[PDB]
Ligand binder design. Structure first.
Ligand SMILES: *[C@@H]1O[C@H](CO)[C@@H](O)[C@H](O)[C@H]1NC(C)=O
Ligand SMILES: *[C@@H]1O[C@H](CO)[C@@H](O)[C@H](O)[C@H]1NC(C)=O
Lengths: 50, 48
């Protein structure tokens, strides 16, 4: 799952089967990591117009 | 793939299915790839 973004800690209650929960635009929003089975948030790197 | 979804909800309604909502979480996916057209339930006997 290649992608660029800032990872944080997540309170999203991923049930045991859930691993890589998405959002509206079918891009990954929160992923459960391998080797740890811990849940992380994916919010995109800060952007905006100049 | 033969998938199994499950849920165990505490009920007390005597005969029919309960009136309400209950989601069935997936339990295990079986990578079997066989031909299935029939199924049968397994029960037990009672000798006293
Ligand atoms: C290895 O990954 C498994 C999950 O498949 C995890 O349960 C285990 O703690 C991991 N071990 C190490 C040493 O990272
Ligand atoms: C499964 O068996 C039936 C006959 O009972 C046959 O018609 C069908 O093509 C078979 N399917 C596969 C995937 O083998």
């Amino acid at each position: 799952l290649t992608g660029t973004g800032v990872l944080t800690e997540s309170n999203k209650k991923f049930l045991p089967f859930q691993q890589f929960g998405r959002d509206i635009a079918d891009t990954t929003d929160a992923v459960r990591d391998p080797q740890t089975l811990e849940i992380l948030d994916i919010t995109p790197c800060s952007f905006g117009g100049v | 793939y033969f998938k199994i979804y499950s849920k165990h909800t505490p009920i007390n309604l005597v005969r029919d299915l309960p009136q309400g909502f209950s989601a069935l979480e997936p339990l295990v996916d079986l990578p079997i790839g066989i031909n299935i057209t029939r199924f049968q339930t397994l029960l037990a006997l009672h000798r006293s």
